[PDB]
Design a protein around this ligand. Sequence first.
Ligand SMILES: OC[C@H]1O[C@@H](S[C@@H]2O[C@H](CO)[C@H](O)[C@H](n3cc(-c4cccc(F)c4)nn3)[C@H]2O)[C@H](O)[C@@H](n2cc(-c3cccc(F)c3)nn2)[C@H]1O
Ligand SMILES: [Cl-]
Length: 137
Amino acid sequence: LIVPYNLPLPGGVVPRMLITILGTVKPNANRIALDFQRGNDVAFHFNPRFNENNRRVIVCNTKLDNNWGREERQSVFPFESGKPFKIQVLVEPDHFKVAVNDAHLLQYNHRVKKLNEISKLGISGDIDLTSASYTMI
Ligand SMILES: OC[C@H]1O[C@@H](S[C@@H]2O[C@H](CO)[C@H](O)[C@H](n3cc(-c4cccc(F)c4)nn3)[C@H]2O)[C@H](O)[C@@H](n2cc(-c3cccc(F)c3)nn2)[C@H]1O
Ligand SMILES: [Cl-]
């Protein structure tokens, strides 16, 4: 699975939909990014950064009209350089549920209301990708 990787989401994102991304973080990693896309806009951007002011942080944002909105930041960082990870993204009708390494990490309230229109997920950054699928729960 070649990074940058695109995972098509036919029908779009829909409540009860569970996205599982398995992979490994590369050594001396700087950044990782998941991008739930609605055209040229990014509905949900999940962005672990490993060195921002000598600190590790997860930045979440929405890009509407080539402009990034309000940053949602999480200090809780479950990723490590040269270590495998499991990211699980559950779609609910009120928020995105993000779990990493089988423990809930963050919630991301839907800025884009047209969930049937979010038809693509992009996996990019400093990672070796093992598995990318989705199913209903
Ligand atoms: O919003 C998310 C976007 O962020 C900008 S960096 C952004 O730059 C702005 C410049 O005006 C501000 O500085 C903003 N900022 C910093 C703080 C702060 C700083 C410290 C502490 C603290 F409290 C607060 N508050 N606001 C920065 O986060 C990235 O380029 C962008 N992006 C990344 C990628 C990308 C491409 C390929 C791979 C990949 F992983 C990511 N492709 N687009 C995306 O991640
Ligand atoms: Cl970045």
